[PDB]
Amino acid sequence: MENFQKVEKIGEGTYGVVYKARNKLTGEVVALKKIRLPSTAIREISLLKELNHPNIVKLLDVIHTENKLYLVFEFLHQDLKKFMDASALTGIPLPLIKSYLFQLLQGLAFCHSHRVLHRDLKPQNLLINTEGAIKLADFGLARAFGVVTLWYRAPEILLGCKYYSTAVDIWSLGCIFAEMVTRRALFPGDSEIDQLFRIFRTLGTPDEVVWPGVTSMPDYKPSFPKWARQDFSKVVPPLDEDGRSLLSQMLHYDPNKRISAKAALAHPFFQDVTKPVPHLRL
Numbered sequence: 001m002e003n004f005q006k007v008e009k010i011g012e013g014t015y016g017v018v019y020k021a022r023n024k025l026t027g028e029v030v031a032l033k034k035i036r037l038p039s040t041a042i043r044e045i046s047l048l049k050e051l052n053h054p055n056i057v058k059l060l061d062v063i064h065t066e067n068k069l070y071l072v073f074e075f076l077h078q079d080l081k082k083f084m085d086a087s088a089l090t091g092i093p094l095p096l097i098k099s100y101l102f103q104l105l106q107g108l109a110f111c112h113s114h115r116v117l118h119r120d121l122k123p124q125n126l127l128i129n130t131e132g133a134i135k136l137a138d139f140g141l142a143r144a145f146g147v148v149t150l151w152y153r154a155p156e157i158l159l160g161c162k163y164y165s166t167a168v169d170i171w172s173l174g175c176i177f178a179e180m181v182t183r184r185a186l187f188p189g190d191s192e193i194d195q196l197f198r199i200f201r202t203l204g205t206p207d208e209v210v211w212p213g214v215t216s217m218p219d220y221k222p223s224f225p226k227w228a229r230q231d232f233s234k235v236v237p238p239l240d241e242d243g244r245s246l247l248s249q250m251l252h253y254d255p256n257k258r259i260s261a262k263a264a265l266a267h268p269f270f271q272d273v274t275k276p277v278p279h280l281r282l
């Protein structure tokens, strides 16, 4: 770590603090993560170094020195949370929302094809550059290591499913899509039950008809209040029918019915996708 000069703190993640740093040898500007503290973890994190894609933040190096772990990542100058805040008065243009959603689905389709899940997608780990690219940061770390935001958590995780699938990432990205469009978080829960009941109040309390097996889930309670579903026209105005159709498939309750990233890329909403240039203030 004597090979790195810390510039400034750029994040306070779940696995540890993230710093902007300069590699004293190559002159490279990187994102340095010091993991807060196992052999199983080293092996799984070593596999992530090979999971390379243009929409995935590159894991450059794994440094296991003095019983401490450091992850060296590719550096990007802004995240989607800051960009959404900077664009709050005018909203992100629909062509740029569509481009970012299409690129994130490409990154998801790639990781999911390698049986790698993110599990904790949120605007703070979606990173953007001046070329119009958007990249996913921290794919696979949750599985590798084993106040936290609940806003993007899939309902099967909240209902105590221990063996959840790639569908959890589609749910999180659907919540992010809705937030880019409306300029407000879709389900801003501040406890696990508030998160669950916010989902229920919008999409309706799930039952055996819409989600076979839901009533046998570990944290399912028959005492859950029964709310009726709301129209998507009310949930994400002024999003057109193609966008609302795609979002509804990303937010299906049953993980098995929820659209895959690969099928989502073929949805008619992406018929006119382009790659615009965002205006970034750095």
Ligand SMILES: O=C1Nc2ccc3ncsc3c2/C1=C/Nc1ccc2c(c1)CS(=O)(=O)C2
Pocket: 010, 011, 012, 013, 018, 031, 033, 057, 073, 074, 075, 076, 077, 078, 079, 080, 082, 083, 124, 125, 127, 137, 138
């Ligand atoms: O470049 C990076 N790579 C990684 C890899 C993993 C990882 N985990 C959590 S963050 C992160 C980052 C990362 C953060 N970058 C960055 C740079 C500048 C600004 C922000 C973020 C927030 S802002 O938009 O308010 C100003």
